[PDB]
């Protein structure tokens, strides 16, 4: 009750303290509503100015006002956004045995043949050999497509967005032609195979006959052709759908018509479309997400508000907590102040008669078997922090020797005694002021362990299917594994990647400038797309991938990061009249 938990409902009413606390709660909502609007409008305006003149040319390429290629095919496939639908691939997830049983078309049992295919067709199937060779080649092609799919889509996601809804088209064909599923059909599986092969030739995105053009078309229609073959497999047609001749012909005609209608029309203003599509969710939008994150990603800064670096471990460190904690120790910065307990500066010229009575025995043992200055620098190390990081006094001593050379002296006790003692002596320029500078440097500059600029490192098991490692078993399924993943504060990507027992493939940060300077421009494009997808989908919202790809390509087209500001807008070699209308009019005009 003291900190504001309203026990009553709106029907019973609120006691005065709960009334005031509720008003304090609602004020925050009013403030956020009145605050987000201007920033959202400004972000949308900047995006529109950035991509206002990007168009789809009659060449089918996507070019800006200076005829510089942005995408060779819009959305990497050449289709329009408003004509595509969610669909499932249905050949990626099934195991080996299930996949073979569902897509093989056994022509040997012959009782399933008599039950599903007609009598005049079963004799043909059992007699011919060219038919059998074609039917085996079809399954070979499907297996190769399955492997390609598993490479393209790790983590086993079937859901995909493709232009023609094949299952609903099949349902419509069944209802239109009054197909009875309880009777054998008159569809020849060879007719099915030949029809699909001929159909795939009429779905042309890249027109040409050179090897380059044929390769471009294959890349442009690979996924849809894989889906088409998976759906119109002959065994699936014979078992599940049970179509007929005229039904199959109508289905092929409808597929051609819909694919041809779902192709992007030249002249579209895809740049402005993408700007609006990515900026309209902004008005409804321990790290930063939402409007501030979008602002940072659009105008890239070298100092993000909450830099982070998710780290994946390679082997037994991923499972066993021992090496996990060991890597956690290796990757976290730690100076001497993090472990020291207390320090003091004494005046003790006598090696034997020591002002401090604790060090007597071992300091005498050290001095008995051999100038120097009479002053001292006695420090005391906290036992809890000393033993937490698995540190050793010999390690601290050798680090001090490396850091200062042999112009210092160091004598240290061991963990046997309850008091762990380090004693330092030097082997204008007066001693006391020099020892205070030695202590101050040795406590804020020592860098015993860890990587500089890496402040704090967490260590927690993942709970999401994108931050988990997913493998493919020997039986072909997808199995999800839980392995320890780290999450640091502060970024230094190169050192963490170079560290022993750290996975150099899946390790990633969220600083775009760092990704650039370490991995190039294509990696920065992919990472920028992933960060934008994460910030957009945190709210559960959906935005078509074409708009994300267009924004990322526009930002990373010229080889260096182009922040969407006056700097990036005027860096383009465009006409002065486009730049004058944006964040700098008179200066640009007078320069030109």
């Amino acid at each position: 009750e003291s900190r504001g938990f309203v026990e009553n409902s709106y029907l019973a009413g609120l006691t005065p303290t709960e009334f005031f606390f509720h008003a304090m709660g609602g004020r925050e909502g009013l403030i956020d509503t009145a605050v987000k609007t201007a920033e959202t409008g400004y972000i949308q305006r900047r995006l529109i100015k950035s991509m206002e003149s990007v168009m789809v040319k009659y060449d089918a390429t996507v070019r800006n006002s200076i005829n510089q290629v942005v995408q060779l095919r819009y959305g990497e496939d050449g289709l329009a956004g408003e004509s595509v639908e969610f669909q499932n691939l249905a050949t990626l997830k099934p195991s080996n045995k299930a996949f073979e049983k569902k897509f093989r078309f056994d022509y040997t049992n012959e009782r399933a043949l008599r039950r599903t295919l007609q009598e005049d067709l079963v004799k043909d199937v059992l007699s011919n050999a060219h038919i059998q060779n074609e039917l085996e080649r079809e399954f070979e092609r499907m297996r190769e497509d399955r492997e390609v799919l598993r490479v393209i889509f790790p983590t086993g996601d079937s859901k995909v967005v493709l232009p023609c809804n094949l299952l609903r088209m099949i349902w419509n064909a069944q209802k239109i032609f009054h197909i009875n599923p309880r009777l054998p059909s008159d569809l020849h599986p060879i007719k099915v195979v030949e029809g699909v092969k001929e159909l795939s030739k009429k779905l042309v995105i890249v027109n040409g006959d050179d090897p380059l053009s044929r390769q471009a078309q294959e890349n442009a229609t690979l996924l849809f052709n894989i889906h088409l073959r998976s759906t119109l497999c002959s065994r699936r047609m014979a078992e599940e759908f049970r179509l007929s001749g005229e039904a199959f012909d109508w289905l092929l005609g409808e597929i051609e018509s819909k694919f041809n209608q779902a192709i992007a029309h030249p002249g579209e203003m895809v740049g402005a479309l993408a700007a609006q599509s990515l900026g309209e969710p902004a008005t409804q939008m321990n790290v930063t997400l939402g409007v501030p994150r979008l602002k940072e990603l659009i105008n890239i800064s070298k100092k993000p508000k909450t830099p982070s670096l998710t780290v994946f471990l390679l082997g037994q460190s991923a499972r066993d907590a021992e090496r996990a904690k060991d890597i956690l120790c290796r990757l976290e910065h730690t100076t001497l102040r993090k472990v020291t307990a207390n320090t003091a500066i004494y005046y003790d010229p006598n090696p034997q008669s020591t002002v401090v009575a604790e060090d007597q025995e071992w300091v005498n043992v050290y001095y008995e078997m051999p100038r120097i200055s009479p002053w001292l620098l006695r420090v005391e190390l906290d036992r809890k922090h000393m033993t937490d990081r698995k540190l050793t006094m010999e390690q601290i001593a050798e680090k001090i020797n490396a850091g200062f050379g042999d112009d210092l002296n160091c004598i240290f006790n061991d963990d046997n005694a309850e008091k762990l003692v380090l004693r330092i002596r030097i082997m204008k320029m007066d001693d006391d002021v020099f020892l205070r500078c030695i202590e101050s440097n040795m406590l804020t500059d020592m860098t015993l362990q860890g990587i500089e600029q890496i402040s704090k490192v967490y260590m927690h098991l993942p709970q999401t299917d994108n931050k988990k490692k997913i493998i493919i078993t020997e039986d072909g399924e997808f199995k999800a594994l839980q392995e320890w993943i780290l999450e640091t504060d502060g970024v230094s990507l190169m050192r963490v990647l170079s560290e022993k027992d750290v996975d150099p493939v899946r390790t990633t940060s969220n600083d775009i400038v760092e990704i650039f300077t370490v991995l190039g421009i294509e990696a920065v494009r992919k990472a920028l797309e992933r960060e934008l997808y994460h910030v957009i989908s945190f709210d559960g919202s959906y935005v078509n991938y074409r708009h994300l790809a267009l924004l990322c390509d526009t930002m990373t087209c010229r080889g260096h990061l182009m922040a969407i500001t006056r700097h990036g807008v005027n860096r383009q070699d465009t006409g002065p009249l486009m730049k004058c209308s944006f964040e700098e009019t008179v200066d640009v005009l007078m320069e030109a």
Binding site: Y366, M369, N401, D406, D407, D414, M427, K428, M429, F434
Partner: protein, 101 residues
């Protein structure tokens, strides 16, 4: 700042007489070698006598020379080699307190 290293090394030059040379002998292995930084025959015999006293109290001079020569080979400078020999003497002292051979 990197100005600290310049300040520090200036103050240590201002801390000159010449560094003392090595002199060859001794029961210790390789004791004629000048290669260990700041080492001497007297420091090696003092460490060998410490190892021999600890092994004799636990109980032979061969084991004492092996512990000294191993530690003088592994340590960065003779001042750390002597401190690590005294650390091995303290570990033998915990073994004798535990009654272990």
């Amino acid at each position: 700042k990197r100005e600290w290293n310049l300040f520090y090394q200036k103050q240590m030059q201002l801390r000159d007489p010449k560094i003392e040379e090595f002199v060859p002998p001794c029961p210790l292995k390789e004791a004629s070698s000048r290669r260990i930084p700041r080492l001497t025959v007297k420091a090696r015999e003092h460490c060998l006598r410490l190892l021999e006293e600890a092994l004799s109290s636990n109980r032979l001079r061969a084991k004492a020379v092996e512990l000294e020569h191993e530690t003088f080979r592994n340590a960065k400078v003779a001042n750390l080699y002597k401190a690590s020999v005294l650390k091995k003497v303290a570990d033998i002292h915990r073994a004798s307190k535990d009654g272990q051979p």
